[PDB]
PDB file of C-alpha atoms and ligand atoms in Angstrom:
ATOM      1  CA  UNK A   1     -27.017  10.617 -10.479  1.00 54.98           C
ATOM      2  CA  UNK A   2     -28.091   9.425 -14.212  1.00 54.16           C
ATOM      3  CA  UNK A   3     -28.304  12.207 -16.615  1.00 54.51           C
ATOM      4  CA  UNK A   4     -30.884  12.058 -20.031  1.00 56.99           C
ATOM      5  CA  UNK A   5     -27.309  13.177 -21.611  1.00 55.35           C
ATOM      6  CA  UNK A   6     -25.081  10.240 -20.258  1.00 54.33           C
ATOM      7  CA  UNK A   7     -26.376   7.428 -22.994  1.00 53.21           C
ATOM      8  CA  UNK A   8     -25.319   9.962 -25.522  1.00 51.29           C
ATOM      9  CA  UNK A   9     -22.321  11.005 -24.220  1.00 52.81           C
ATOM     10  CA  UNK A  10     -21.258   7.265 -23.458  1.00 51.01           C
ATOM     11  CA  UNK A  11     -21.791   6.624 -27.593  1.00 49.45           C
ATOM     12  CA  UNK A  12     -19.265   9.931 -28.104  1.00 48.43           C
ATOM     13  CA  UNK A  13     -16.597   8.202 -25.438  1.00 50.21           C
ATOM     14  CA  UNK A  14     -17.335   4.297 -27.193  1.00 51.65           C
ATOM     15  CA  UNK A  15     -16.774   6.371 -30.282  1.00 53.82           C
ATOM     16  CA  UNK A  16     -13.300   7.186 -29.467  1.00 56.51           C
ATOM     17  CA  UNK A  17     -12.833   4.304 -27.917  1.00 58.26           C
ATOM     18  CA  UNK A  18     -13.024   2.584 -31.438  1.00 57.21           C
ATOM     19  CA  UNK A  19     -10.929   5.163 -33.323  1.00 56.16           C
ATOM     20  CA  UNK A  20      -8.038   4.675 -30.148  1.00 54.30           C
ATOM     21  CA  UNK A  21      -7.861   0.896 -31.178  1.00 54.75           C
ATOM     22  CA  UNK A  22      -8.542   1.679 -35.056  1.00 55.82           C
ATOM     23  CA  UNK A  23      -5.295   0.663 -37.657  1.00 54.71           C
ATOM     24  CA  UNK A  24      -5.621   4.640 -37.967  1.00 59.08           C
ATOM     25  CA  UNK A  25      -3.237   5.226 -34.601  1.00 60.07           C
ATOM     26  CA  UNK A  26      -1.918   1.246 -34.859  1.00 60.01           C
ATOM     27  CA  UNK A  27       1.790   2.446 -34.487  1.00 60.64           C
ATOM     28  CA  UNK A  28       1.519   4.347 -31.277  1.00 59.49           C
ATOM     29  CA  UNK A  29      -1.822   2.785 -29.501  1.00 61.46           C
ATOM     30  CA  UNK A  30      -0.359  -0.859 -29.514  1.00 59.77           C
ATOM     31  CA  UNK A  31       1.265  -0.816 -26.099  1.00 55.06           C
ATOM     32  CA  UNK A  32      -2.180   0.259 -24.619  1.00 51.09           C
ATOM     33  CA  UNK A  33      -4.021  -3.285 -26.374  1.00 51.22           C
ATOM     34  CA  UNK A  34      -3.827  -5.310 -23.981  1.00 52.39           C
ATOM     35  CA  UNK A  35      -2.918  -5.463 -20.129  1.00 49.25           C
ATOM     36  CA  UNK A  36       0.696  -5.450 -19.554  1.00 49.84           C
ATOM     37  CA  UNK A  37       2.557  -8.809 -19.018  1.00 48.51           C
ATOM     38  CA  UNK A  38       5.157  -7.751 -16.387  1.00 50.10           C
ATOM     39  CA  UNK A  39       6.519 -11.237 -15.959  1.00 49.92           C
ATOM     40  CA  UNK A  40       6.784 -11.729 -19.799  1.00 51.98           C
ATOM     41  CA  UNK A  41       8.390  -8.088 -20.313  1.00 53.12           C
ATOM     42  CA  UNK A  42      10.555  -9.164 -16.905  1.00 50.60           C
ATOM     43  CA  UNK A  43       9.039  -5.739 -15.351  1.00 51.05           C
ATOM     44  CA  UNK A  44       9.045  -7.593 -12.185  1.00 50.48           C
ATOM     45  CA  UNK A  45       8.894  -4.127  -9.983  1.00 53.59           C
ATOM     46  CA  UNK A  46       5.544  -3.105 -11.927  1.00 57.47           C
ATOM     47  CA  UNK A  47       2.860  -4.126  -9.581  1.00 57.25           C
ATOM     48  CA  UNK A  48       4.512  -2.718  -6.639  1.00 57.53           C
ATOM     49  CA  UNK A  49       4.731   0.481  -8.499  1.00 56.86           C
ATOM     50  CA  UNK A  50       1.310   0.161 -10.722  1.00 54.53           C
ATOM     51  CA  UNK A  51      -1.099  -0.107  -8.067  1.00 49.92           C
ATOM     52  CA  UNK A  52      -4.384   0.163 -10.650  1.00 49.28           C
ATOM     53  CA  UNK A  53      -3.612  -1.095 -14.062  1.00 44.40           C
ATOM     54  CA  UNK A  54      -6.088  -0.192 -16.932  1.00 45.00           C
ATOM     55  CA  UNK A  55      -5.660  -0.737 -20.901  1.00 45.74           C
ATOM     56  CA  UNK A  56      -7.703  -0.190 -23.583  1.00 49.25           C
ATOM     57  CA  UNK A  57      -9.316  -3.666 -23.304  1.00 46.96           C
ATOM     58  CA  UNK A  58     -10.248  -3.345 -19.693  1.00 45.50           C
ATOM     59  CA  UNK A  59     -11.982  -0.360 -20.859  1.00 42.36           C
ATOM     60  CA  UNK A  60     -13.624  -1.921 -23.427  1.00 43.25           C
ATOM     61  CA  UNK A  61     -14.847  -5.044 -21.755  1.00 46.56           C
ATOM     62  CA  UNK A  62     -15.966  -2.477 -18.913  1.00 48.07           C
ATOM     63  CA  UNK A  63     -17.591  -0.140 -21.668  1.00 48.33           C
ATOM     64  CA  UNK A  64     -19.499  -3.431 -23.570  1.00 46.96           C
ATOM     65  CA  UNK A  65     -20.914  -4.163 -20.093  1.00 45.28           C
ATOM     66  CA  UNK A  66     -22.489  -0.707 -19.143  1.00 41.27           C
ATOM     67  CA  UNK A  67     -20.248  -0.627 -16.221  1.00 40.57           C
ATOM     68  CA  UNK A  68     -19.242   3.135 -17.293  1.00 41.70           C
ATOM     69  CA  UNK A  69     -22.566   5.109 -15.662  1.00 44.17           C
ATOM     70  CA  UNK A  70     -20.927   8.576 -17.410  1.00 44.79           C
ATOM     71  CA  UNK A  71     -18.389   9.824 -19.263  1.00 44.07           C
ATOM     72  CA  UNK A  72     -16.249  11.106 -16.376  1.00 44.65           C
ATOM     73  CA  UNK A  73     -15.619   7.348 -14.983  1.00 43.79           C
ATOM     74  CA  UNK A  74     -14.819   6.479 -18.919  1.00 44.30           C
ATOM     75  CA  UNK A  75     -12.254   9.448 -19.052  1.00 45.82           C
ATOM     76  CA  UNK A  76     -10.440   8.709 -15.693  1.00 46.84           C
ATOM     77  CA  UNK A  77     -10.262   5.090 -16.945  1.00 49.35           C
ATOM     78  CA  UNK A  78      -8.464   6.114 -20.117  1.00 50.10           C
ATOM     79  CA  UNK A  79      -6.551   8.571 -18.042  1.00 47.59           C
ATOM     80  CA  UNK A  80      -5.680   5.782 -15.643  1.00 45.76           C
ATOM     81  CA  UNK A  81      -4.199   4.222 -18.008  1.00 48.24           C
ATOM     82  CA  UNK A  82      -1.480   6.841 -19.836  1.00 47.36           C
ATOM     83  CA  UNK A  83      -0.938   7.864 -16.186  1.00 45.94           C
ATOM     84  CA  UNK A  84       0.032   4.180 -15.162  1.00 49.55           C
ATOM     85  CA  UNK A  85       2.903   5.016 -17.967  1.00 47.10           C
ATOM     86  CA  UNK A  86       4.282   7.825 -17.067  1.00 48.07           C
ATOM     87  CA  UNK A  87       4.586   6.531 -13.711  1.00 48.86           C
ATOM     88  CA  UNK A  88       6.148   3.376 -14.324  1.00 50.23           C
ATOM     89  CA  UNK A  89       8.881   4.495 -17.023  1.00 51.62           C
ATOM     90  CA  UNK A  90      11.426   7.163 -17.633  1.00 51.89           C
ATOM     91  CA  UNK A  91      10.094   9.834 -19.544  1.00 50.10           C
ATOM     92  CA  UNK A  92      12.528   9.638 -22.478  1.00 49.88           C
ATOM     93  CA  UNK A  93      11.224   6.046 -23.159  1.00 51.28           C
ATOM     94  CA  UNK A  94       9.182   5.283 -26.724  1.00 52.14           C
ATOM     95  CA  UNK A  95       6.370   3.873 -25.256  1.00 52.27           C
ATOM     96  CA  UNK A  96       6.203   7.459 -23.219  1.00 52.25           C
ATOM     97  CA  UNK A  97       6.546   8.670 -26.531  1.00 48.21           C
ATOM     98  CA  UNK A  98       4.096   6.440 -27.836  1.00 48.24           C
ATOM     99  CA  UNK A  99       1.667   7.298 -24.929  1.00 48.53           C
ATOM    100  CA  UNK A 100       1.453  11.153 -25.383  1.00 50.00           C
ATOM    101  CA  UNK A 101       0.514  10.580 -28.871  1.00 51.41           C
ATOM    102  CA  UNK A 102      -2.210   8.270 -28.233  1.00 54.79           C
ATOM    103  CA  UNK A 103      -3.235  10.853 -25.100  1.00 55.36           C
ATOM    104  CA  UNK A 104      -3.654  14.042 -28.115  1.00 54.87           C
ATOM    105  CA  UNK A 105      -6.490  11.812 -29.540  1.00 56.49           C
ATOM    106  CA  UNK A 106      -7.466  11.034 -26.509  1.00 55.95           C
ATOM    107  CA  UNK A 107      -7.922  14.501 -25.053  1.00 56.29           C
ATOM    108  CA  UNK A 108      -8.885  16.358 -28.306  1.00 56.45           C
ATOM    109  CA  UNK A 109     -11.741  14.093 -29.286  1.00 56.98           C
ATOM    110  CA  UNK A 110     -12.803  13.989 -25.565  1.00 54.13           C
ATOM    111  CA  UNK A 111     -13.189  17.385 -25.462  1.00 52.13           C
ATOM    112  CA  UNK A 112     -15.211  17.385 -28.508  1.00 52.59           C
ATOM    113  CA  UNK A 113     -17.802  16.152 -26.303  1.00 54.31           C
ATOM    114  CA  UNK A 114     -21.526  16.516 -28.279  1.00 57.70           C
TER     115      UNK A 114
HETATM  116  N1  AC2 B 201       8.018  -0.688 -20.317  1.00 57.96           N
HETATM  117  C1  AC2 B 201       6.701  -0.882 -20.328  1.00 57.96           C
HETATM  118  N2  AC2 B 201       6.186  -1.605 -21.369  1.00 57.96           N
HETATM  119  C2  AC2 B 201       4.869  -1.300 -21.587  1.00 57.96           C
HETATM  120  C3  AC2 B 201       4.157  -0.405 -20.819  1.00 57.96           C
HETATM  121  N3  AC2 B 201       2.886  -0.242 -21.350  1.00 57.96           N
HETATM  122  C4  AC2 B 201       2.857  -1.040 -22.393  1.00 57.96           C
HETATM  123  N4  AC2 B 201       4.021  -1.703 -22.583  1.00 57.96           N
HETATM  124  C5  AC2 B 201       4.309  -2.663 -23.651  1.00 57.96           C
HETATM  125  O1  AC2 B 201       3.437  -3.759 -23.625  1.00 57.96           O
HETATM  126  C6  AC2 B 201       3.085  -4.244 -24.912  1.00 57.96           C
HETATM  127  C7  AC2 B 201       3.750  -5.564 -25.160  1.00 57.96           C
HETATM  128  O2  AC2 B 201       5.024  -5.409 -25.765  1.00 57.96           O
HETATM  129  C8  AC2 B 201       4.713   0.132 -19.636  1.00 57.96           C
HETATM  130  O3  AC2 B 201       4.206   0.985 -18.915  1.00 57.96           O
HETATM  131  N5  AC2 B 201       5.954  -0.379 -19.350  1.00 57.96           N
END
């Protein structure tokens, strides 16, 4: 059920949204651009093992067309998304690396929630 808050809290998660693809976190949000290629990265096993996939411009095209109704959905999204990556790879591997990083600002500014 719609909340008066959700609009407002929807600007807070777009606002993170931004500063996760800003040149401020560039060297550690890249992987998360764009959807992953498995056939160009020849990660040929990853759809049997990612059964959801989710990146940062999924959640922006879904964000840009309202189809986040609260911050929660936004948030499991995002989550989604660094879980797909721990799932897929070992956990010694950069872009793990690379994903707990991006996940700090993530959770930190999340749970600055206004
Ligand atoms: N190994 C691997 N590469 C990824 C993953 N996520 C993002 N990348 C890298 O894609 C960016 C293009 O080089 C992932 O989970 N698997």
């Amino acid at each position: 059920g719609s909340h008066m808050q959700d609009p407002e809290q929807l600007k807070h998660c777009n606002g993170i949204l931004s500063e996760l693809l800003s040149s401020k976190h560039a060297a550690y949000a890249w992987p998360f651009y764009k959807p992953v290629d498995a056939s160009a990265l020849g990660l040929h096993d990853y759809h049997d093992i990612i059964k959801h996939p989710m990146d940062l411009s999924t959640v922006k095209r879904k964000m840009e067309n309202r189809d986040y109704r609260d911050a929660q959905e936004f948030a499991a999204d995002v989550r989604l998304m660094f879980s797909n990556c721990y799932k897929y790879n070992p956990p010694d591997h950069d872009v793990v690396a690379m994903a707990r990083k991006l996940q700090d600002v993530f959770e930190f500014r999340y749970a600055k929630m206004p």
